[model samples]
Target chain A: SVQIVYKPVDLSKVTSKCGSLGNIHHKPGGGQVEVKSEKLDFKDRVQSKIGSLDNITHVPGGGNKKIETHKLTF
Target chain B: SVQIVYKPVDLSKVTSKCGSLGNIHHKPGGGQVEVKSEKLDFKDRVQSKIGSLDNITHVPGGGNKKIETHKLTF
Candidate 1:
């Protein structure tokens, strides 16, 4: 089955902590991407990483995905 | 010094919108227990409340923990 993954974006390393253990699907908009994994932790981490994205549209089952339509400051 | 908090469980007044500040840890597991707060927006809202945990394992620094093992339909 398809799962979610989360990993810290090591800005310095320019790589996510989860590495390539999942499928990184880029959203059509070109600003964000979704990483699907067999690991739920990765999914949660992806949700978290999405929060840190330039413009997060949704964290899906977590928070108000609509609010993420705008830019996040911190 | 430590912090990480995220509240929004209010399931019929479940209560969780970033209140009470921090620290609620219980291990040895009868079912599921894990809350660590250091104010990174309630540690990204308890990694999004362990993605609605029923049997979530390992939310270390974001994602790739496990499929929560069992029980979650939402």
Candidate 2:
């Protein structure tokens, strides 16, 4: 299996208060690309991060993958 | 017949070079909340905007509503 992981994160678009921890997985061989963009605002922080083109698919046995869910305020 | 238009725009999350202009419409009486958040990177502009809860839904006869579409570069 020829699997290579690459990540393209865009942090210059968001604030430092809500630093994000998200990932996108893309297997060119498999033609699979997904954006796991999450955790933009976590723990009272307004920071945001957009992770694109990373090879990470939610696996059952996959070690810890960081994700943050903030309360959608009205 | 009550049709009120409300717009919620969030622009503090992007850059000035890619200014964005989008819209979202939500009619409480009709239980409508849609985000037309588009044009994050418009015409060489790197600014981003997330317009939510705006009362705008593509109406055929509706007067000139603004919208910008750019080439999605990968």
Candidate 3:
């Protein structure tokens, strides 16, 4: 008879470091480095709107400092 | 290059007053009030009994409001 063993993978750490160039070390599989760049575009798109509100108000000391504040309040 | 301008809409106020019949003021879009009536139904269904229990009680005084003490031990 053959025996099978199941091991849990660290999905949280993998997702946390996704889209960035980094190395990951696994106990059974040893060490491996993978440079993931596929999902970088999506991250850039979501973050593109970040700090955009400040740019809208070019007047000195008149622009909204916090973008998240407007988002929640509106 | 041509510049495109985007204006934010008051979505919260629109949604908050959706079912209400009232007046709205806006010069750019003009002021208009619309009345809408849709289907209405019972909010809660009839609650059917799932389970039950029974209990019995005995009077301490005798049948005619007179206290005739008859001690009985079970």
Candidate 4:
């Protein structure tokens, strides 16, 4: 009889059911923040706009600097 | 003379300078939305709390059922 050692947990199987909202990191000043997605393929691309950075006390200077709304490729 | 036809744009180089805030999709009801990241590695994991999903008119019901603040594995 062969013994099975360790089994790896597939995140796809887990996340697919619930549908993940991904990750959102804290950049305090919102200068250079990393956008990471572990589940996306190399060909995948997505884009979003930072809406209303106003009145958010944590982000310094609010909407004065004007952040760019751009796209990212996997 | 040799012509440089098409060169691939390295996202790492492009995004490294300004940094990226990743992607955010709208799920009106906020249930089972797909979170995609084109920049993260398989082993990377990041988590965030959906702070104050309240007072936002777009999100219906506004935190009645209690959304799970879970972690995503990249």
DockQ of each: 0.03, 0.03, 0.01, 0.04
Worst ten-residue run, lDDT, model 1 chain A?
A59-68
Candidate 1 C-alpha error for residue A57, in Å: 29
lDDT of 1 by residue, B1-74 (tens): 32323222211211112212222232322222233333333322234423122222221222211111222233
Q: What is the lDDT, from 0 to 100, of the residue A65 in candidate 2?
A: 23
Model 3 stretches with alpha carbons more than 4 Å out: A1-61, A67-74, B1-30, B40-74
Q: What are the chain A TM-scores of the candidates, in order?
A: 0.16, 0.19, 0.15, 0.14
Model 1 Cα shift for residue A7 (angstroms): 39
Model 3 lDDT per residue over B1-74, tens place: 32323233322110111122222221121122222324322223332211112122221111111111222122
Candidate 3 lDDT by residue in tens digits, A39-74: 212321132221111101111111112111111110
- lDDT by residue for model 2 (B1-74), tens: 32322232323232122122223232322222223322232333233323222222332211212232222222
Candidate 4 — what's its lDDT?
0.25
Worst 10 residues of 4 chain B by lDDT: B57-66
Candidate 1 structure quality by residue, lDDT tens digits, A1-74: 43433222211211122222222232323233233333333322334432111322221111211111112122
Better of 2 and 3 by DockQ: 2
What is candidate 1's TM-score against the reference?
0.14
Please say which candidate is ahead in lDDT: 2 or 3. 2
lDDT (Cα, tens digit) per residue for candidate 4, span B1-74: 32222222322211111223334332233212223344432222433321122112121111122112222221
TM-score of 2: 0.14
